[PDB]
């Protein structure tokens, strides 16, 4: 539905705060900041020699946190492209995430170690707690306002901490239905409201409302707002995301390189988008204020927009025949 | 501990294994879930009736003799359980 030839080795992308720019990582380890309106590249940053697998914009949009595969995280000013700060860790980093309401702070999910929240002003770090002490794979994310931290382990356990004190404000373990746990693949939140989603190893996305987890307390049984899956193919989900408003949810079937689109309230599947059967789906993102969806597959990015009835359909356009309502004086002088 | 969707826990390999035991060569996909349904429906009765026994048994655990008398009442009696 529209691709870009000007970028190669697309690996990970991230919309800015207003959905005007897109920073995509490349295998060479370069940042390609490409613009939507001019439909061209806005910037090229020599980030790492190692490909970049995690990228996040700052709220003001002037900072981008990038993670190399060399366990090298670095902050870059979008105007200049300089490495503002640079750090390295053990247990290679799985993800970075700016704090949405404090760009000085940034959480980092490493591979084998617990996620740690650092600051840029001071090169300090706060290691977030781990429930089972043996997960070795815990994804973590700020909420919409950056007030709480949601951490999900490979054993389905879900901890909600407060971002400042790291104190356990809520907890619950998700189930595979019967009695078993499932590897929490990812935690996503809505940029609007409080609904969030969890991708798990059961290939079943679970949509909740964080207020219900907060009122559920520690070690409770919160039910999901929704349960979403491909009941037909039972396909895993490499990457999923909400819509900009938060009423549409998309999942990327890397198994068959497709895109499933459900709703939030009803949860019925909006639609499906099919990509090149030969392409391996890698990354998925939604335009924050547009029905536009960016996909990264086999190093190539594709764009999926959604237009209205007009752009040619605007006499007064009607859809179905209209019986004329004759009047009393319809034949009168 | 609320359970769900163990019906699909029935593997298509299991279904085709049972079919081969029944002496079947070629099978379509549309069967399995259909099969499953029937399965459910089938057991749909007995357990209830079984626990119905357990109902009158005034007990919390369910026993074999329950399903014994069920299959009996279901005209599908079984041996080897008292």
């Amino acid at each position: 539905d529209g691709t870009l030839d000007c970028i190669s080795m697309a690996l990970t992308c991230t919309f800015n705060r207003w959905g005007t720019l897109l920073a995509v990582g490349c295998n060479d380890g370069r940042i390609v900041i490409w613009d939507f309106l001019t439909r061209g590249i806005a910037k090229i940053i020599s980030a790492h020699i190692h490909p970049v697998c995690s990228l996040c914009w700052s709220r003001d949009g002037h900072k981008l946190v990038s993670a190399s595969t060399d366990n090298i995280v670095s902050q870059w000013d979008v105007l200049s492209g300089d490495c503002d700060q640079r750090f390295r860790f053990p247990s290679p980093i799985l993800k970075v995430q700016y704090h949405p309401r404090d760009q000085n702070k940034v959480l980092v999910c490493p591979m084998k170690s617990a996620p740690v929240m650092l600051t840029l002003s001071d090169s300090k770090h706060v290691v977030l707690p781990v429930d089972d002490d043996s997960d070795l794979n815990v994804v973590a994310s700020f909420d919409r306002r950056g007030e709480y931290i949601y951490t999900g382990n490979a054993k389905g356990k879900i901890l909600v901490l407060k971002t400042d004190s790291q104190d356990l404000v809520a907890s619950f373990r998700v189930t595979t239905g019967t009695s078993n746990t499932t590897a929490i693949k990812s935690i996503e939140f809505a940029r609007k409201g409080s609904c969030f989603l969890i991708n798990t190893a059961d290939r079943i996305i679970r949509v909740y409302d964080g207020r219900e987890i907060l009122t559920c307390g520690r070690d409770g049984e919160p039910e999901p707002m929704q349960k979403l899956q491909d009941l037909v193919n039972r396909t895993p989900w490499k990457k999923c995301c909400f819509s900009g408003d938060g009423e549409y949810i998309v999942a990327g079937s890397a198994r068959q390189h497709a895109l499933y689109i459900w709703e939030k309230s009803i949860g019925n599947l909006v639609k499906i988008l099919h990509g090149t059967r030969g392409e391996l789906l890698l990354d998925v993102a939604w335009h924050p204020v547009r029905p536009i969806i960016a996909s990264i597959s086999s190093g190539v990015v594709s764009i999926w927009a959604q237009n209205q009835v007009e752009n040619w359909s605007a006499f007064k356009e009607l859809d179905e025949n209209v019986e004329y309502e004759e009047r009393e004086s319809e034949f009168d002088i | 501990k609320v359970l769900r969707d163990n019906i699909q826990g029935i593997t298509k390999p299991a279904i085709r294994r049972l079919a081969r035991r029944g002496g079947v060569k070629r099978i379509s996909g549309l069967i399995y879930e259909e099969t499953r349904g029937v399965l459910k429906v089938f057991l749909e009765n007995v357990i209830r009736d079984a626990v119905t026994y357990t109902e009158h048994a005034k007990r919390k655990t369910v026993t074999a003799m329950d399903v014994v008398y069920a299959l009996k009442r279901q005209g599908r009696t079984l041996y080897g359980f008292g």
Binding site: - | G9, I10, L18, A19, R20, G23, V24, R26, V46, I47
Partner: protein, 98 residues
């Protein structure tokens, strides 16, 4: 050059060995979870005998192979080696299961 047996042949031998074997062909735990799921529908938190659930699964699988058997037979009368859902439905129909 790689060898592949003609279709059915492997499944044919599977049929032969399954009529040869007698044990169950269903994994225990999934069946048990299904049974308990069905149970909570009528009443929640009910316990069971392992003997009881073994009986459930054996008797089920027996009914199931009987259904597969006579549906195979019907499909013979349907002159096909592939099975059709309608065969199962009408079999239940003759089995008074409708």
């Amino acid at each position: 050059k790689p060898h592949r047996y003609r279709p059915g042949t492997v499944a044919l031998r599977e049929i032969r060995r399954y009529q040869k074997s007698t044990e169950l062909l269903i994994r225990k735990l999934p069946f048990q979870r299904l049974v308990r799921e069905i149970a909570q529908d009528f009443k929640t938190d009910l316990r069971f005998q392992s003997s009881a659930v073994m009986a459930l699964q054996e008797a089920s699988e027996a009914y199931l192979v009987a259904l597969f058997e006579d549906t195979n037979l019907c499909a013979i009368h349907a002159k096909r080696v592939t099975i059709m859902p309608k065969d199962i439905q009408l079999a239940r129909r003759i089995r008074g299961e409708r």
